[PDB]
Subunit: 306 residues, 3 copies
């Protein structure tokens, strides 16, 4: 039961917990459609703390807490007393004095788990540098299930920057709970990390690397595209060399399975042609909307109403 | 007839639409003044996306949502994934997955309508560069009609930067829905733009230019003062010639009519002196307050609860 | 008695019965909050949060307070507002009070808050004016002192660090004179307690003594009130790094402290209280912060005519 627990890492997620949570997510989405009265989190305040920029992850948590009848406390680093020199631990300790939950994204990996040590209320990891994005894995798995019917028996193809990409890290790890085959399409420099490729191996999930998107596609049921993480590179030179390696265009999606989904945790810069947007296999915006409902489910369960 | 519609341009309003909207706004303002329950928009969510700075337009939409029982997602460029390089089009379609209505201010003219072209939720233009500001002009006509009892049969003198002023572009072109006269008092390099002038001329309203506040004033019912837009200038030299030229003072006012109002979208820098504000004809603080109630009407009707 | 509609700018305007009532109402709301009693006492009502200097506790605990009463909150920061377009302070404040029923304002120029409230139609609450006052941090400081030790009377409080720049130590020292207290002061000569304050504290008849170090000041301390060396106000960095870190509280110093005693800090801290002190029961600085939410719920409720 997720009640009152730190949500730090995909590891802790039982298959039973995820399915409880997919179910509550489908319930909460029904009531929003039915224009039902949601006073579920009336009284409860969420502390949204972002030290690293966000659009979907911050907006999805905020919209969710609103739509459960809760309130949100906005916290950015730039206008906070961080600027007086406050430590990350003290910032988190203080925001819990006001809030029932803490959503923390931060640029340094393990910072969230480090701050969550002395935190006396549930802290949700919304991204820890290149480490992990746990609720994003959860919504991607929900979306796969939603778009195709099952997750078991599926071939997931992760393309792009796997080294920095905290979403694929979490997502690869978590897809070890489903009978899947993973394929990686990266340049040598941005290959999926060792601990991750080692973790996935030890669960038995068959990993495979490919050089291009042309090769992986015809067997790919789930095509997960990523963004060349420009702000994690040691030098632009390294970045601009890698920028634009893979570019999904409608020409490429003419040898993709009829049954098939293209995802992206967003934002995209170059890596998906806008023309792809019309193909109904493109579910990356539907992926966004799912996120709000899963995060509604997590906030309801972690605060212990569903 | 405004339900589920983008609010992009004043040329999309008719008279019935406006009169309905003002009527809903009086109706909502009374509800607020008696202190009744207001859950007109309970559960619902507005995306507040400002790419330029704002005080009035952002606060009024948010106070408006809040008094209707709704909730607001505050979005900023700076803390957003714009920084990762996400385009305006994605940003607007992604916020719509969380929200029922999108309020967009953008520094590029035509941006908001381009962003609204293929967005599936309603988008309210809250200012698109030197283009338009439809809801300001909607609350300006409201305030005029609130402060004098009519707009029909009146003369309006627009003073300041008319070339850059999106407020006056909207207001002038909308005023031609009434029986009115227009006076223009700017330096030669900031006259009203030509396409806007030809529209007014095409609809058959009097466009008369003038030399100064002194000259237009005697016969002016609405004195609409605007700011010199520093951010809109190429060279500071070109702004510092234009800056502090037209200045309203109590002495200049003694020549005005008793049945007259001075308006200003705000903020002012120096164009109206601080002594002017104690004259009951100073109707610019009541113009902002009216904007909140117009925005309430505007939201409830666009979201189909009035 | 009674702060309905009233501006909240200085602790000079507070009586004892206004504090009592406000402390009482802070307890009433806490418990209603503890019972998940579904509160909508300020449903409809809007607060404008106007911060011209950065914040964490003050902004968040005003914003949490409102939300927990059922009200709304308009966030206002200088950087992304039309302050950028030239707008002066009065205009901004006067504009936000058109939208909102109460205005909380934090500004860097001393006195700019009272001066912006002059011509304002709604209540304006001072959440900090430069190196001047911090009236609602003074109220929550005295609440925490009362809750932590059973009473404020007969206590000696010791204030430590940057007394000169300390907007919260000016309010508190001034406010405390409405009890029977003995004040001890610890600061390097360049950061002593301003002369306006400590003659003001002279007048009301409250003893004052200027101790040389924490260790000397601890034996008889019932409230050790620590403060941050205020970097953003100094000359001159050269004057800052001379002062930065000259008083630091450790678990070793504490082993001579009274048993019935508490350790307070308005926050944040940089290094003046060892993280190693946080597990110590008497370290009340986080309980002091939660307390603030409930105090500032009682402010909003009372200033808007609820209790
Ligand atoms: O940024 C990416 O490329 C992937 C991933 N994206 C997101 O979380 C979406 P957002 O940053 O808009 O909240 C991330 O790591 O932040
Ligand atoms: O900014 C001006 O001077 C005029 C006008 N002003 C406003 O809308 C006021 P604000 O920027 O505070 O929303 C505009 O078109 O931006
Ligand atoms: O910052 C201090 O040292 C004391 C005092 N602190 C506060 O008010 C807390 P905050 O800045 O997080 O609102 C201040 O003067 O700002």
């Amino acid at each position: 039961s997720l009640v009152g627990q730190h949500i730090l890492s995909v590891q802790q997620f039982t298959k039973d917990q995820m399915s409880h949570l997919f179910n509550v997510a489908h319930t909460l989405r029904m009531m929003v459609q039915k224009e039902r009265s949601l006073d579920i989190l009336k009284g409860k305040v969420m502390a949204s703390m972002f030290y690293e920029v966000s659009t979907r992850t911050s907006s999805s948590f905020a919209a969710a807490m609103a739509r459960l009848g809760g309130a949100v406390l906005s916290f950015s680093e730039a206008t906070s007393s961080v600027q007086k020199g406050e430590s990350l631990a003290d910032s988190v300790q203080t925001m819990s004095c006001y809030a029932d939950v803490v959503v923390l994204r931060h640029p340094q990996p393990g910072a969230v788990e480090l701050a969550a040590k002395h935190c006396r209320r549930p802290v949700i990891n919304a991204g820890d540098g290149v480490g992990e994005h746990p609720t994003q894995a959860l919504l991607d798995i929900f979306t796969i299930r939603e778009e195709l019917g099952t997750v078991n028996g599926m071939t997931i193809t992760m393309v792009g920057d796997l080294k920095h990409g905290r979403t694929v890290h979490s997502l690869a790890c978590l897809l070890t709970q489903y009978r899947v085959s993973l394929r990686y399409v990266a340049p040598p420099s941005l290959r999926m990390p060792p601990t991750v490729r080692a973790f996935v191996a030890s669960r038995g999930t068959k990993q495979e690397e490919f050089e291009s998107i042309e090769e992986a596609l015809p067997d790919t049921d789930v095509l997960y595209m990523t963004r060349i993480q420009k702000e994690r590179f040691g030098s632009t030179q390294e970045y601009e060399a890698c920028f634009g390696q893979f570019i999904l265009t409608p020409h490429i999606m003419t040898r993709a399975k009829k049954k098939m989904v293209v995802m992206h945790p967003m934002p995209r810069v170059n890596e998906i042609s806008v023309e792809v947007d019309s193909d109904p296999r493109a579910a990356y915006f539907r992926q966004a909307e799912n996120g709000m409902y899963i995060r509604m489910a997590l906030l309801a369960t972690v605060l212990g109403r569903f």
